[PDB]
Amino acid sequence: LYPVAIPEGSIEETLTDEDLELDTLIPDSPNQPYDMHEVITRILDDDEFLEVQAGYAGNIVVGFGRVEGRPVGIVANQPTQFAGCLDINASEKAARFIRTCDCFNIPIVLLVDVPGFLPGTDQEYNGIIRRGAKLL
Amino acid sequence: APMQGTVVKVAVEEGQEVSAGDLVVVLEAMKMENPVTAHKDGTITGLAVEAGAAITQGTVIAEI
Amino acid sequence: GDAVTAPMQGTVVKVAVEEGQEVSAGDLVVVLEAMKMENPVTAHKDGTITGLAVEAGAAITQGTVIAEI
Amino acid sequence: RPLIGINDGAGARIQEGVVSLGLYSRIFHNNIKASGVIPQISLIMGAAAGGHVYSPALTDFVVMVDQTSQMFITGPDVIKTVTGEDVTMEELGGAHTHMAKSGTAHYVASGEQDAFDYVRDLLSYLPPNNYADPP
Amino acid sequence: MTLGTVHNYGDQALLLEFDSTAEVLAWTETLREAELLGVVDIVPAARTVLVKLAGPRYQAPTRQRLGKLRVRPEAITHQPPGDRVDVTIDVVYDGADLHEVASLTGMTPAQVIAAHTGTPWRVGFCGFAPGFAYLVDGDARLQVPRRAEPRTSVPAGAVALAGEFSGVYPRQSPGGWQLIGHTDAVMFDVNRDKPALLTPGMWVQFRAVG
Amino acid sequence: GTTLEVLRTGPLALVEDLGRPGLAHMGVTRSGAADRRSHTLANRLVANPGESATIEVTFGGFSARVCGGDVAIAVTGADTDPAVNGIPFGTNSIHHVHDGQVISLGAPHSGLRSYLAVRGGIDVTPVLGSRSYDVMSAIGPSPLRPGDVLPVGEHTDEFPELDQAPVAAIAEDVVELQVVPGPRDDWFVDPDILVRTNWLVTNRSDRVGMRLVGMPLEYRNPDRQLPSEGATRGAIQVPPNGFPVILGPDHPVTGGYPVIGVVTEEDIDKLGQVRPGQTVRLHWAYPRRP
Numbered sequence: 001l002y003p004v005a006i007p008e009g010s011i012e013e014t015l016t017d018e019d020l021e022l023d024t025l026i027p028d029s030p031n032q033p034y035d036m037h038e039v040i041t042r043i044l045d046d047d048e049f050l051e052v053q054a055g056y057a058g059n060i061v062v063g064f065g066r067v068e069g070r071p072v073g074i075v076a077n078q079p080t081q082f083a084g085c086l087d088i089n090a091s092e093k094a095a096r097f098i099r100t101c102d103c104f105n106i107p108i109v110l111l112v113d114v115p116g117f118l119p120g121t122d123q124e125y126n127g128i129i130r131r132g133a134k135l136l
Numbered sequence: 137a138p139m140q141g142t143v144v145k146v147a148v149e150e151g152q153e154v155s156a157g158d159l160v161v162v163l164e165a166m167k168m169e170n171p172v173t174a175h176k177d178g179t180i181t182g183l184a185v186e187a188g189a190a191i192t193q194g195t196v197i198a199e200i
Numbered sequence: 201g202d203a204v205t206a207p208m209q210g211t212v213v214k215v216a217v218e219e220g221q222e223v224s225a226g227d228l229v230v231v232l233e234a235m236k237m238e239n240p241v242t243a244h245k246d247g248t249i250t251g252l253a254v255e256a257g258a259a260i261t262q263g264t265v266i267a268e269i
Numbered sequence: 270r271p272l273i274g275i276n277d278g279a280g281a282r283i284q285e286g287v288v289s290l291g292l293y294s295r296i297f298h299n300n301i302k303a304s305g306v307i308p309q310i311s312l313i314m315g316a317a318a319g320g321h322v323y324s325p326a327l328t329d330f331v332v333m334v335d336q337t338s339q340m341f342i343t344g345p346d347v348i349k350t351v352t353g354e355d356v357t358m359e360e361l362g363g364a365h366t367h368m369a370k371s372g373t374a375h376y377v378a379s380g381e382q383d384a385f386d387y388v389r390d391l392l393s394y395l396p397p398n399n400y401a402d403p404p
Numbered sequence: 405m406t407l408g409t410v411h412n413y414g415d416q417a418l419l420l421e422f423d424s425t426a427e428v429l430a431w432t433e434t435l436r437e438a439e440l441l442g443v444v445d446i447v448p449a450a451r452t453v454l455v456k457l458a459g460p461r462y463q464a465p466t467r468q469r470l471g472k473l474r475v476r477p478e479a480i481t482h483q484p485p486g487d488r489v490d491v492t493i494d495v496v497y498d499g500a501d502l503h504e505v506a507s508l509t510g511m512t513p514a515q516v517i518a519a520h521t522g523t524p525w526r527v528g529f530c531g532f533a534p535g536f537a538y539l540v541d542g543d544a545r546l547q548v549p550r551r552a553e554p555r556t557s558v559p560a561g562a563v564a565l566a567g568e569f570s571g572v573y574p575r576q577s578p579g580g581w582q583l584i585g586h587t588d589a590v591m592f593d594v595n596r597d598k599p600a601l602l603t604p605g606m607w608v609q610f611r612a613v614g
Numbered sequence: 615g616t617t618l619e620v621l622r623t624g625p626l627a628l629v630e631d632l633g634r635p636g637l638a639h640m641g642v643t644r645s646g647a648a649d650r651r652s653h654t655l656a657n658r659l660v661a662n663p664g665e666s667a668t669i670e671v672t673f674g675g676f677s678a679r680v681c682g683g684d685v686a687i688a689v690t691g692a693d694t695d696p697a698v699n700g701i702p703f704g705t706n707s708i709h710h711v712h713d714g715q716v717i718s719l720g721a722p723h724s725g726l727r728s729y730l731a732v733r734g735g736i737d738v739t740p741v742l743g744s745r746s747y748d749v750m751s752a753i754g755p756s757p758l759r760p761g762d763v764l765p766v767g768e769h770t771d772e773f774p775e776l777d778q779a780p781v782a783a784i785a786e787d788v789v790e791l792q793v794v795p796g797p798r799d800d801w802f803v804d805p806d807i808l809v810r811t812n813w814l815v816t817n818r819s820d821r822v823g824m825r826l827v828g829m830p831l832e833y834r835n836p837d838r839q840l841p842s843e844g845a846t847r848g849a850i851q852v853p854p855n856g857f858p859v860i861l862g863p864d865h866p867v868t869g870g871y872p873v874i875g876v877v878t879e880e881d882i883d884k885l886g887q888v889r890p891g892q893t894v895r896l897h898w899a900y901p902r903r904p
């Protein structure tokens with residue numbers, strides 16, 4: 001843990017303008033995507049975020065950050081790829097990251113924006129059932 | 137500039153007033169001459185491109 | 201600027217033009233081999249080749265000036 | 270003691286809504302708790318669709334019946350709408366597809382009695398739990 | 405003979421190689437009668453036939469079926485089967501170069517136009533433009549080589565020949581042939597029930613107007 | 615019935631469908647949508663049969679006004695932030711537009727072509743049995759102009775049951791393609807330069823073909839002429855200057871230059887989205903051997 005001084009007062013009394021930038025983030029249409037890093041970097045300390053496997057299975061974002069000095073692992077659906085669907089590669093990417101955090105007692109924070117699993121015969125024949133069950 | 141292309145024409149003078157729907161520039165791209173049309177009345181300020189120059193998509197032709 | 205510059209550290213496997221040749225924007229100037237891949241360098245403006253300072257088989261640093269205009 | 274599920278399927282009961290998803294989550298959480306503790310076996314004997322498929326995947330052995338059982342997360346018509354490929358339920362998710370291609374099935378029985386015979390054979394080798402010795 | 409060399413042309417098409425246009429056209433008619441399930445198009449050309457398929461799934465089955473087909477020997481010909489002329493084309497021979505390059509091969513301009521008028525032309529393969537057609541199997545002394553240069557602005561209705569080919573340009577276009585005359589026949593029109601006046605496998609003959 | 619009024623065309627807007635196949639005996643090339651998978655996806659989303667026509671909008675910028683009734687629309691392909699009355703709605707998603715509302719497409723963040731489909735299809739008059747436009751012959755419905763009125767056809771009884779399709783994001787720069795080798799790969803002194811070169815897409819690329827620059831390919835016999843032969847979308851010609859050209863949907867029915875390879879049907883539709891200035895890499899789809 002890094003030393004961080006917790007400000008006093010309620011959650012509603014302690015909203016910053018950077019927090020208030022979240023209230024307008026989500027597009028009005030349920031189908032218009034947005035970059036989930038706009039949430040991750042605003043809920044993490046200093047906006048600091050160490051992304052893991054950034055180039056692989058870009059429909060899920062995983063990585064480390066801090067919240068009031070505590071390390072945390074972030075696992076977040078990314079609407080900008082496959083509309084945020086889960087697939088084989090994202091399921092394996094997130095499953096091993098979560099199990100690595102769990103080995104070392106790092107809390108996990110999930111940011112969920114998932115319309116379902118990615119439809120397709122390629123996913124069926126490659127084993128989306130068997131390899132999606134990994135993230136469960 | 138809506139696309140990468142060559143500025144085959146620049147149609148206005150520096151500082152020139154312009155009316156919405158006039159032409160600023162013409163770009164050769166897609167084996168086609170593409171006109172750039174002014175979207176509002178204004179004054180063509182700092183016309184940053186030269187005829188026959190190649191340019192890349194999204195570059196500012198002028199402020200308006 | 202008028203300098204055509206090498207985008208990468210590599211070896212000039214083919215010079216496509218000579219000085220005083222007319223060129224148009226997007227014409228090929230040189231090809232650089234690096235990492236077992238071959239990469240074009242192309243003229244940024246209409247003009248004519250001057251200041252030509254590289255030759256086939258020369259290994260050049262990133263940012264080397266190839267030619268001008 | 271071993272747990273045998275004979276899964277048949279058709280997914281969540283759409284009229285009941287999100288409660289069916291919470292009950293799926295609970296069933297999966299229990300399959301994970303039980304994983305490596307008691308032998309879990311899933312017999313697939315119909316169209317296991319949607320949520321019905323992850324529970325077998327979390328069990329230890331999946332036995333399918335050749336021409337008459339299927340598993341898929343999302344159906345051929347949504348697959349057609351998104352991907353444009355026409356496929357049948359049998360081609361998409363039949364026991365042959367989950368044996369030869371997906372690798373999810375452990376046996377393909379010639380019929381329901383053969384599937385029961387194979388499940389009894391499996392149980393004849395497996396102990397009742399990880400604290401017991403094999404028979 | 406029984407089949408040419410065959411190449412994959414991508415995964416969705418097959419290319420058959422042949423020694424002469426009589427092969428390509430007789431094989432074209434053979435493949436038309438074969439009705440090969442999963443073919444979507446057949447393109448005859450100067451030395452080849454390209455077969456286009458509904459998808460990669462059909463390529464290997466089609467390549468396997470091709471070995472089963474055999475062309476009828478009597479269908480390979482260099483002259484019309486009833487000696488017929490199916491289409492007659494009025495032409496005025498105000499050609500731009502029938503004298504300058506071509507007639508120097510030997511035949512005077514009058515002899516050139518008389519041979520061209522008097523000899524049946526086959527409608528061969530089709531390409532370059534809609535309703536343009538490569539006429540073939542005309543009189544062998546007319547076979548001047550291609551100009552070794554491009555042309556441009558070649559008039560609509562302009563009548564030309566080069567190599568073993570003759571033809572009529574349907575519209576102002578960058579042709580590449582010697583020009584023997586002109587015709588006012590509408591070679592292509594999408595609004596005509598037969599948009600292309602000339603289609604492969606017909607036989608055409610020019611008729612002189614001047 | 616419902617119609618659209620074209621308020622803005624963008625740089626180009628064309629009516630497109632699956633094209634006019636089989637007319638090679640007339641010399642008519644198939645044309646059709648440049649990205650058939652995107653076109654057909656937009657039709658499937660609006661529950662059209664895939665031969666129903668859509669508007670291929672290039673570099674976005676298209677805008678139109680729905681008049682005379684409500685209509686379901688979908689936009690697929692290049693992400694232009696399509697919007698109704700300025701409120702964005704998802705690319706690759708359906709939206710229901712009320713009478714009098716305005717549909718607009720921005721500039722594409724990546725890719726090149728967006729397909730607007732309407733329930734019942736764009737019911738302009740077919741030419742040679744297709745509503746596609748061929749940029750080389752100009753056969754087909756005229757490229758759209760401001761103030762054009764586009765009829766909306768009568769829809770089938772099927773209804774849109776899916777709100778959106780997930781689609782892989784179109785690559786921003788380097789596009790990697792699988793090429794079937796030959797048939798004329800033996801014409802060249804070293805044809806594996808094709809796969810060893812980072813090709814650059816020139817500003818000359820259009821629906822007839824994409825023109826690359828890179829390492830020149832060397833002819834084994836540079837005076838050798840080719841007997842003209844049939845061509846297809848995605849065939850990689852090598853004109854004698856040695857710079858490859860990848861044929862587009864409006865390619866001429868026969869070509870005069872050796873085809874060194876053809877892009878696999880798996881990948882041809884990715885060519886439909888590559889803009890000028892992108893990099894291209896090629897790999898042999900299976901081992902090239904003479």
Ligand SMILES: CCC(=O)SCCNC(=O)CCNC(=O)[C@H](O)C(C)(C)COP(=O)(O)OP(=O)(O)OC[C@H]1O[C@@H](n2cnc3c(N)ncnc32)[C@H](O)[C@@H]1OP(=O)(O)O
Nearest residue numbers: 278279280281282283284316317318319320321344345358
């Ligand atoms: C998270 C889980 C999900 O999202 S599941 C969402 C999709 N649910 C499905 O319908 C499963 C996939 N569908 C299919 O491929 C087939 O319809 C299935 C259900 C697998 C087999 O159905 P089939 O043997 O053809 O029978 P049928 O279509 O004639 O229906 C018979 C009766 O069953 C009912 N039924 C079926 N599925 C559901 C369901 N998920 N929720 C509620 N009811 C369901 C039908 O309504 C029908 O009832 P009835 O006999 O018509 O009164």
Ligand SMILES: *C(=O)CCCC[C@@H]1SC[C@@H]2NC(=O)N[C@@H]21
Nearest residue numbers: 818822823825866868869870871
């Ligand atoms: C634009 O430069 C691409 C041109 C592709 C079509 C032209 S037609 C005439 C040439 N012959 C051929 O096969 N392709 C070329």
